[PDB]
């Protein structure tokens, strides 16, 4: 019926404490989604080109050239932390939980409303909105994951984080195949390097369509759609950070002489000369046993080529790295490769009363200390004569290939059988929750964007489209675009995301770091006088844990 509501708005986070210290967390999110009709009812194949930018020698890092199928449909993506948890709930979770499991996910659409804009021809323009009770909203649910997976948080296009603000969906578009060549150059590179877009190789063409691969439900003003509960199987996400590096693994050396009076200069002394110490070292030609040369069980962290660009059929891409930098915690402005930087708009955290289109930005300096500090590690000759000379060492200050600004660490990879690393920490509120595992026979060990990875499947993507509202002059034989009555839709989206977490237990004398309100961040969690809201980034691994 038109006058009977088909659902209830619900945005309450529930905690239900189970046996053995586990907590059943239910995050109900509810939004009002506004949807305009598509620009055109037809699928487009658009080749986006920015050769003007890359035509300038040395700008190869600014390539946006690609090919995309632009579709008339719109994607309703809720794969972002902010959509589910308000700052207080996240504070509770990070301060008192230790591990997080993704349990279930369900979503539904109700109170579908379709309206048409009749723009009067009156000399002073005016427009009246009318309820078209017969219009239909097409809802498609890719339950079988037939369509390409296109997470929205990567582009900051998920639903809004404010329950009391209407949100808009994102027009769905998926990459089409293409070939590209961008020979790197630098300021001073003579001529124009080879920069060509070869087009689409026929063997790799895929042209998906929702109308052909997904059943489509037509919802009038009195209808509702529910996706049913989806159950995850993702690995647990740890809410604790590791501080121990190789230098802090195992039994420390025995201090034969200990300080006698408190002070900043009263250090402990091992006493025994370095060459006469007792231990085990992987270096078989030196008797010097040191805190640096001692044998650790394995390697915590791996050095990777940083700011290295790799070319493939589609052009250049930046090599990802799964660890943060060392010493970047001192200042966010001193961040470097590996620290994820998020840019977001007024829907996703930026002060809602800000003027201008400049996105709000922040670099997330993770609390885990498993990264690398390239200025430190060096290489020296096998003879290990000490002190080393210029001919027997390769310091980070040394050039490679004659380039004064590029040193050896830029092309150094220490990933090996002994490498150990942690999963990506959650980022609030702009961070993604789950991601799909790759279809490759051999699959990546971890993803750099989401902490939870679907082993089998992720929930089907939800697509919404205002059904065509034809005028009486329609003619399919006309090459011109279809004439449509201006129409839009407002519908309420309600989702339930269920987590399971473990409550932390104190295991040390000293307290641990905790998220708290303070005089500096006070006014970042309350509205301004003109209704301005914001959601600042919050750290998710404040509690430490021992690695070995």
């Amino acid at each position, epitope marked *: 019926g038109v006058g009977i509501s088909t659902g209830t708005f619900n945005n309450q986070t529930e905690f239900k404490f189970l046996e053995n210290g586990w907590v059943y967390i239910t995050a109900n999110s509810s939004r009002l989604v506004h949807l305009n009709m598509p620009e055109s009812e037809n699928y487009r194949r658009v080749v986006v080109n920015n050769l003007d930018k890359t*035509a300038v020698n040395g700008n190869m890092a600014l390539d946006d050239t690609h090919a995309e199928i632009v579709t008339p449909w719109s994607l309703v993506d809720a794969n972002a932390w902010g959509v589910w948890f308000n700052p207080g709930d996240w504070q509770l979770i990070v301060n008192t939980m230790s591990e997080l499991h993704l349990v279930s996910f369900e979503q539904e659409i109700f109170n579908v409303v379709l309206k048409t804009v009749s723009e009067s021809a009156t000399q002073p323009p005016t427009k009246v909105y009318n309820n078209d009770l017969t219009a239909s909203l097409m809802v498609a649910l890719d339950s079988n994951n037939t369509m390409p997976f296109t997470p929205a948080a990567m582009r900051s296009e998920t639903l809004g984080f404010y329950p009391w603000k209407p949100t808009i969906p994102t027009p769905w578009r998926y990459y089409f195949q293409w070939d590209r060549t961008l020979i790197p150059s630098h300021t001073g590179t003579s*001529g124009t390097p080879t920069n*060509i*877009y070869h*087009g689409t190789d026929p063997d790799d063409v895929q042209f998906y369509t929702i109308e052909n691969s997904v059943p489509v439900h037509l919802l009038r003003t009195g209808d509702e759609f529910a996706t049913g509960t989806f159950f995850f199987d993702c690995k647990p996400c740890r809410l604790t950070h590791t501080w121990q590096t190789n230098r802090a693994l195992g039994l420390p050396p025995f201090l034969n002489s200990l300080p006698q009076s408190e002070g900043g200069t009263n250090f402990g002394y091992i006493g025994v000369q370095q060459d006469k110490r007792r231990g085990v070292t992987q270096m078989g030609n030196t008797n010097y046993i040191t805190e640096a040369t001692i044998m650790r069980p394995a390697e915590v962290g791996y050095s990777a080529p940083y700011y290295s660009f790799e070319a493939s059929t589609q052009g250049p891409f930046k090599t990802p790295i799964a660890a943060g930098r060392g010493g970047a915690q001192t200042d966010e402005n001193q961040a470097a490769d590996g620290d994820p930087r998020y840019a977001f708009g007024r829907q996703h955290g930026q002060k809602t009363t800000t003027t201008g289109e400049t996105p709000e930005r922040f670099t997330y300096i993770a609390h885990q200390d498993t990264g690398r500090y390239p200025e430190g590690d060096w290489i020296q000759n096998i003879n290990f004569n000490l002190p080393v000379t210029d001919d027997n060492v390769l310091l980070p200050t040394d050039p490679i290939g004659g380039k004064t600004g590029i040193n050896y660490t830029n092309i150094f990879n220490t990933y090996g059988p002994l490498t150990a690393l942690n999963n990506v920490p959650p980022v609030y509120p702009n961070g993604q929750i789950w991601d799909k595992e790759f279809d490759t026979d051999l699959k990546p060990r971890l993803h750099v964007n989401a902490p939870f990875v679907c082993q089998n499947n992720c929930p089907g993507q939800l697509f919404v489209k205002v059904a065509p509202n034809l005028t009486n002059q329609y003619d399919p034989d006309a090459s011109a675009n279809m004439s449509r009555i201006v129409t839009y839709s407002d519908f309420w989206w309600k989702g339930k995301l269920v987590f399971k977490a473990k409550l932390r237990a104190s295991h040390t004398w000293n307290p641990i770091q905790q998220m708290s309100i303070n005089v500096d961040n006070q006014f970042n969690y309350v509205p301004s006088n003109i209704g301005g809201m914001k959601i600042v980034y919050e750290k998710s691994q404040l509690a430490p844990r021992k690695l070995y």
Partner: antibody
Amino acid sequence: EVQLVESGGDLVKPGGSLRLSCEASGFTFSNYHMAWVRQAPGKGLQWVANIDSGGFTTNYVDAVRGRFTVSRDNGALYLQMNGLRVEDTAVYYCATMKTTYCIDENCNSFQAGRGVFDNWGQGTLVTVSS
Amino acid sequence: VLTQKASVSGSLGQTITISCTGTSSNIGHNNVGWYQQLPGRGPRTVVSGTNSRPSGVSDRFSASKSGNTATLTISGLRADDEADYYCSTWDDSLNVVFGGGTHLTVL
């Protein structure tokens, strides 16, 4: 249709300064590299300067190098002229430098390039004398 | 400066050719553009490489490039073709280099 309109041409004294403008409409002005090209009375076309699509780099000819400057504001082009000399008297045009060239008739494949101007403005006359 | 012929002349309906020349190190690797210049008008791009013409340009124009030389062919002269023709390209010294022009004329 693409529209480029120049302005600012006028009589000026030698050794002074001036500002010529090139307003653009009907196309994505920010997606095209732009160029200032001058022609003296009855003489051939002479390249004055050029600027990329983001202002990262600008290039000049030796005759105006160190004297003039070029800038853009996503809506129009500007040429700042300093140390004007008698020979500078000429008509100036703003043209889009074709940054992409397709290599097939339907032009499914395209390549980067330089040295071809696609669209031109109207042009403006600058006279420097007493 | 690229080399060009000062002028040419021909009868109406004749298919004619004009040439622009320069060092292969600059006219070779870079593209070449041909523009028309009528009295009381700014240069109009007639040929933009790959024998492709801008919209609104008569199909009579054609162009080709080989090493030091670039050739522009007109398939049948018309009274409105009496005008200056200008070749331009990029130069590996990071310049934009034009030719001296050629005043096409009709007998």
